[PDB]
Design a protein around this ligand. Structure first.
Ligand code: FAD
Ligand SMILES: *[C@@H]1O[C@H](CO)[C@@H](O[C@@H]2O[C@H](CO)[C@@H](O)[C@H](O)[C@H]2NC(C)=O)[C@H](O)[C@H]1NC(C)=O
Ligand SMILES: *[C@@H]1O[C@H](CO)[C@@H](O[C@@H]2O[C@H](CO)[C@@H](O)[C@H](O)[C@H]2NC(C)=O)[C@H](O)[C@H]1NC(C)=O
Ligand code: NAG
Ligand code: NAG
Ligand code: NAG
Length: 473
């Protein structure tokens, strides 16, 4: 078709429709949502990215970058059939300056590879998610929370500059001192404004030791959930969690536990965690000291860490939702707990809920001031918890299944003003219509995002079904 001929004339490498590699390059992370691209560009340099974008614009098709392909909604494929997919995973080089400790990271680099290179070359790191196969592109442009985030912030907070290919093929560099409006927009909503062709990240010196631990929670009835969660949020909100401590609740039908990573040794951990244990009347278990990379591996749930193979094909079948909330009033705790015990525990699929200890007085995430970037959730009191709700099937996903997580989220949002909750596009939820998605993902920053979208991509070349809409001018 026209897009294929345009790419050929422009000397852009592609994955041909009738090739083995099409299957891999086109594949979703979420097997519930396959889409068939119009074509797949396979750039090895920024020039190819420019040429691919220009071809999309000239021919009249939509285009989307795909970095790691982990979008829960397959938005790296366009979120619908018939987009040019700019597959970035042949571009995964990571370079670390020995002097400034700034890393230059190609946009197809996955987190495991990044972590490995930074650590092996200079004992450096930046703050990012668990899951070594996750692409740096989608992850860092919309937040990126992990087991260093209470200590060191979101992946987006370590971005120091970026080179971007705009919808008309122009090149720009964005930083605090250059195209600062674009730099603001990128840092929370980056999928909407261009294709990032190179990232520069600051780093911190990796701690020599980290200690993983677990605290099993007796959340077997609604009363225990309410009381335990009520104590836990009160503790976090009141400054109970030290900067070195990074933690979450993981819940499923069969166990609930706190899981943490303490940036320090086991004895430091025991001392630091004692007050919470006394508050919750629980005990520590599975206390394990690690070197930095062993710490990453512990929560990676992956044999492969340093992943660079374009054959990468990890996938699951699922529905997922997210939330960001303040502390919850007890009546909301009660409804959420009732749903957990009476509904979630009886759902005959592999579901889980993660509640990250996200905000509060000591969190590096919510220390970032409210004007620093488009990412919306920076208030230390109002943005206390981050949630991932995940509903996985091993056969095909049942078409009536969505009511489960939808109902659970309603138990939260019913009792919270819209100013006290939002949602997180790194757990992209295609159940949300376009208007609602923009509002819940970006909240108070939507209006400015829409203005910058009109300035930078007025034709919506980078469209997907939950993309920011250009402001009307
Ligand atoms: C599958 C998976 C996802 C995880 C995992 N662990 C996470 C964690 O511990 N913390 C988190 O905060 N998030 C975790 N996630 C979710 C991922 O963070 C999100 O799914 C990311 O958005 C995925 O990034 P990526 O793998 O790059 O996904 P794509 O589908 O390729 O892109 C998503 C989105 O971003 C746009 N985009 C990609 N690349 C670019 C560039 N270079 N420039 C602009 N825009 C870009 C895409 O077009 C798309 O819209 C653990 C697991 C197992
Ligand atoms: C990533 O970095 C490697 C260097 O480590 C680049 O590899 C070189 O590629 C050129 C031409 O493609 C070869 O002539 C060299 O021999 C390669 N060097 C080595 C040491 O292998 C590679 O080009 C870079 N990849 C990207 C996408 O930019
Ligand atoms: C490519 O896109 C950019 C932004 O969409 C255009 O640059 C802008 O041009 C306007 C007026 O022409 C200026 O007022 C802005 O300040 C520019 N923005 C930036 C970021 O440079 C650029 O003109 C476009 N190029 C073409 C050929 O259309
Ligand atoms: C502590 O870290 C060092 C590397 O910094 C590592 O060699 C050692 O094994 C770690 N100790 C423990 C108990 O994990
Ligand atoms: C919840 O379980 C605890 C024991 O784990 C019990 O003491 C408590 O009474 C239970 N509450 C209700 C309402 O069943
Ligand atoms: C644990 O860390 C503390 C620093 O907080 C240090 O004083 C102590 O030496 C460490 N313990 C061991 C066994 O290294």
């Amino acid at each position: 078709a026209a897009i294929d001929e345009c790419l050929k004339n422009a000397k852009v490498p592609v994955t041909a429709r009738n090739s083995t590699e099409w299957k891999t390059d086109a594949s979703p992370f979420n097997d519930r949502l396959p889409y068939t691209p119009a074509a797949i560009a396979k750039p090895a340099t920024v020039e190819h990215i420019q040429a691919a974008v220009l071809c999309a614009a000239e021919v009249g098709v939509k285009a989307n970058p795909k970095s790691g392909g982990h979008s829960y909604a397959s938005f790296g494929l366009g979120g619908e059939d018939g987009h040019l997919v700019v597959e970035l995973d042949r571009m995964y080089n990571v370079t670390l300056d020995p002097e400034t400790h700034i890393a230059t990271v190609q946009p197809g680099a996955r987190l495991g590879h990044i972590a490995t290179v930074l650590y092996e070359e200079g004992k450096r790191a930046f703050s990012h998610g668990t899951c070594p196969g996750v692409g740096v592109g989608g992850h860092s442009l919309h937040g990126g929370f992990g087991f260093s985030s209470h200590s060191h912030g979101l992946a987006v907070d370590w971005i120091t500059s970026a080179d971007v290919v705009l919808a008309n093929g122009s090149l720009v560099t964005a930083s605090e001192t250059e195209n600062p409006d674009l730099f603001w927009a990128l840092r929370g909503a980056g999928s909407n404004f261009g294709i990032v062709a190179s990232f520069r990240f600051k780093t911190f010196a990796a701690p020599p030791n980290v200690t993983s631990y677990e605290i099993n929670l007796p959340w077997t009835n609604s009363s225990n959930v309410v009381k335990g969660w009520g104590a836990l949020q009160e503790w976090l909100l009141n400054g109970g969690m030290p900067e070195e401590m990074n933690m979450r609740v993981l819940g499923n039908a069969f166990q609930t536990q706190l899981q943490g990573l303490y940036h320090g040794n086991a004895s430091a951990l025991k001392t630091a965690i004692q007050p919470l244990l006394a508050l919750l009347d629980a005990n520590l278990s599975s206390v394990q000291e690690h070197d930095w990379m062993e710490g990453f591996r512990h929560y990676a749930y992956s044999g492969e860490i340093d992943i660079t193979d374009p054959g990468y094909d990890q996938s699951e079948t699922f529905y997922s939702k997210s939330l960001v909330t303040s502390a919850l009033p007890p009546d909301v705790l009660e409804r959420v707990a009732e749903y957990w015990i009476e509904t979630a525990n009886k759902v005959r699929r592999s579901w889980y809920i993660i509640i990250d200890m996200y905000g509060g007085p000591n969190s590096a995430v919510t220390r970032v001031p409210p004007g620093a970037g488009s990412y919306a959730f920076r208030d230390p009191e109002r943005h206390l918890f981050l949630y991932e709700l995940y509903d996985r099937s091993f056969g095909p996903y049942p078409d009536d299944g969505f009511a489960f997580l939808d109902g659970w989220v309603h138990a939260f949002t019913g009792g919270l003003d819209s100013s006290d909750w939002g949602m997180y596009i790194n757990y992209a939820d295609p159940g949300l219509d376009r208007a609602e998605a923009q509002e819940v993902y970006y909240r108070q920053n939507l209006d400015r995002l829409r203005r910058i979208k009109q300035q930078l991509d007025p034709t919506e070349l980078f469209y997907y079904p939950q993309a920011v809409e250009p402001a009307e001018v």
